[PDB]
Write a protein that binds this ligand. Structure first.
Ligand SMILES: Nc1ncnc2c1ncn2[C@@H]1O[C@H](COP(=O)(O)OP(=O)(O)O)[C@@H](O)[C@H]1O
Ligand SMILES: Nc1ncnc2c1ncn2[C@@H]1O[C@H](COP(=O)(O)OP(=O)(O)O)[C@@H](O)[C@H]1O
Lengths: 48, 37, 370, 370
């Protein structure tokens, strides 16, 4: 998330989001609430 | 503690032990050579 | 409410009660029924026609005694109503049937109809915010602080042993004998006329209870004490007379170990408990040899423990160390364990709304107790 | 780039593990999960319901054991993940998983689906950097440091014979038998009911397994040894009970060479073993005469290799000197051999990165199989 905290341009921002998504792959290993996950989805939407 | 609690009601194992008990009492060697000649 | 739910030591012989956090069941009294034996005519006498308290067990010759509990199970629900009214007396509570949750006790292997009947009264007569009933065995280990162990209660309703592995009960391994000290008193009455003693009254029965709890004791040697030349000590009767004793002072409690003498087919409390042990795992019994818990008022006897130990010695396995506890309060401890349970915020499943009972009934409680 | 790998010597009965370059497997715990039989309504006891190891062996009573793996083919793959998660326990690892190379074990004559699903676990649920597992017999040879050899493992119910020439196995001369101590103990249970005894519980059966491992050996001439009378030196249970023996001490382990007597079209370890030897080179058998690798812990028997020498004389060649290698860390031999391999800079060529799995996965499994 520090990448978006220090996000500068489209390429860096976009690729940072890509790395973010790859880290988001941990759901199969966490089991976190679907609704809270959706909260995070739109949270990232607001952040973006 | 429950000392005054014991003073109130009479169900206490007075002058008696609370515990009873049944007392005490006193490689793989290798080289299995089938020397066939 | 932010205060103490009603803790009731639903006692077989003697029922007690109090509240959460407290260590004194403030009110203790036997499970009898006190109505009168005669009719007052004189203007200015005592009235009520239904008595509890000391006045009831004062004028025994004037008050008809009717014990309403049978094998730990009452069938005189009207008397239970009146009993709970006495529980609600100004001498006791001055409260309502809605201000606190109700905790009562039980014994297993009973008809669910009892639980039905019970809750029916508890909610048709009362408007209890939360009702719960369970086994004192859990409460017993709570009093001992343990987790596992086998507890045998000896009340005047039913004597039953429960093996316990951290609360994970084994319903296929619990034993329950329906004997009481009441029968031993009756048996004593048999010894009375054997020795020529004319006693048949209900008032006399309580005197025999005093004899039981005082003049009787336990003879450790089974048949060696059976052949002892008695001396027939004499007990000075409270009214002012005196009567001999004889060897019967220890003979009668042996019927609890030889029920076949009266005709009841069983195997003796000791062997019955051993059979309960036999209805379990193999090496977990080894723990139970150390885990021996005593309970019930019908355990207070001079010679009780060591004799029972000898019984166990005959029932002992091949060279296994055995530890036997003996709590002081073999009855009160259960009430205190109930006070501990009532002092829990994790009583969530146990507190049940009255509306829920209206919706389902005792079955809803059966799901919780099962 | 990698970290210190961990060799996981998967014994068919007991899995073992430990970091690279070491001499003793760090962990040694079996392959089964228990779940409690009895439940409770009591508040304050244990939790978990899934235990492996001293927790399970501790309270065997309710935890009903179930072996998830059968001949490598496990059916509780999800539970194996939980098992490996237990390998990542606080008492076990406290390390990470997606940042370290590892090493498990692999026996031959298996469906590829197992390896496929294994890669799915370690590279879908995990993100292990690089990992490659191969044939266990080579690890035993690493422990020997001897080019050619006839490895014969001994799992719980799994056995296989493999000849290897300087790091080269014989795919057309490698055999396998689907049994070891598993049905031997089951057959002992058969003997138990043959003389009236049942040990139907899972834990009870493992106790029987321990008894087998505790008192069993090999006889000389089975039908001729049957002519005597077994005095049956009774052992006494942890429960404290009589334990007879019967021919079990010598007859029951020889079931391996009598599969027809147990119902299986098979011949014998040594039989099919020497047959594959006959399928090998006319010259390499000479080398294998001294190169007889014994492995697997099921092999613990009095005169084990000696009766095997008798089997050698049964399958005698045309008078050529033979020699057997019988070490004492046969189970550990594979773990230590992996540790040797794990202590090699040659794993660079012997590995498969996770990136390779990302690229192909299944194709990397098929193509880069060995
Ligand atoms: N001091 C005593 N000695 C022997 N027995 C006793 C004593 N006090 C009470 N009891 C026995 O306890 C029984 C009363 O049942 P109890 O143990 O009170 O069960 P509960 O508390 O569940 O009513 C009676 O049979 C009586 O004989
Ligand atoms: N005293 C003994 N006699 C025979 N076998 C034994 C003895 N003690 C342990 N074992 C065996 O050790 C073996 C270890 O098997 P396992 O770990 O499954 O081997 P592998 O690593 O070949 O799969 C088990 O099969 C068990 O039966």
């Amino acid at each position: 998330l520090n990448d978006l905290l220090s996000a500068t341009e489209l390429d860096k921002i976009r690729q940072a989001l890509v790395a973010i998504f790859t880290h988001l792959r941990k759901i199969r290993n966490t089991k976190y609430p679907i609704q809270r996950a959706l909260r995070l989805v739109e949270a990232i939407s607001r952040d973006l | 503690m429950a000392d005054p609690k014991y003073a109130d009601l009479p169900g206490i194992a007075r002058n008696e032990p609370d515990v009873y008990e049944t007392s005490d009492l006193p490689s793989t060697s290798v080289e299995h050579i089938i020397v066939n000649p | 409410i932010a205060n103490q739910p009603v803790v009731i030591d639903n006692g077989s012989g003697v029922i007690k009660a109090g509240f959460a956090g407290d260590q004194i069941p403030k009110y203790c009294f036997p499970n009898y029924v006190g109505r009168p034996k005669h009719v007052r005519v004189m203007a200015g006498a005592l009235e009520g026609d239904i008595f509890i308290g000391p006045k009831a067990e004062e004028h025994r010759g004037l008050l008809s005694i009717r014990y309403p509990m049978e094998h730990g199970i009452v069938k005189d629900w009207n008397d239970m109503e009146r009993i709970w009214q006495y529980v609600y007396s100004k001498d006791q509570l001055q409260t309502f049937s809605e201000e606190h949750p109700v905790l009562l006790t039980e014994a297993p292997l009973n008809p669910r109809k009892n639980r039905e009947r019970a809750a029916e009264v508890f909610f048709e007569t009362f408007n209890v915010p939360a009702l719960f009933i369970s086994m004192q065995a859990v409460l017993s280990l709570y009093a001992t602080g343990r987790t596992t162990g086998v507890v045998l209660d000896s009340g005047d309703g039913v004597t039953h042993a429960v093996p316990i592995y951290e609360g994970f009960a084994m319903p296929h391994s619990i034993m329950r004998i329906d004997i009481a000290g009441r029968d031993v008193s009756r048996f004593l009455r048999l010894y009375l006329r054997k020795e020529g003693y004319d006693f048949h009254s209900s008032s006399e029965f309580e005197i025999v209870k005093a004899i039981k709890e005082r003049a009787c004791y336990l003879s450790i040697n089974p048949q060696k004490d059976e052949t002892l030349e008695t001396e027939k000590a004499q007990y000075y009767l409270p009214d002012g007379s005196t009567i001999e004793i004889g060897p019967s002072r220890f003979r009668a409690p042996e019927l609890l170990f030889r029920p076949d003498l009266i005709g009841e087919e069983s195997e003796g409390i000791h062997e019955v408990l051993v059979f309960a042990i036999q209805k379990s795992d193999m090496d977990l019994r080894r723990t139970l040899f150390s885990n021996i818990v005593l309970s019930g008022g019908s355990t207070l006897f001079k010679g009780f423990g060591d004799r029972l130990l000898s019984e166990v010695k005959k029932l002992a396995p091949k060279d296994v160390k055995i530890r036997i506890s003996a709590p002081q309060e073999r009855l009160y401890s259960t009430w205190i364990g109930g006070s501990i349970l009532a002092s829990l915020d994790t009583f969530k499943k146990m507190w049940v709304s009255k509306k829920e009972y209206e919706e389902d009934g005792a079955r809803s409680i059966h799901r919780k107790t099962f």
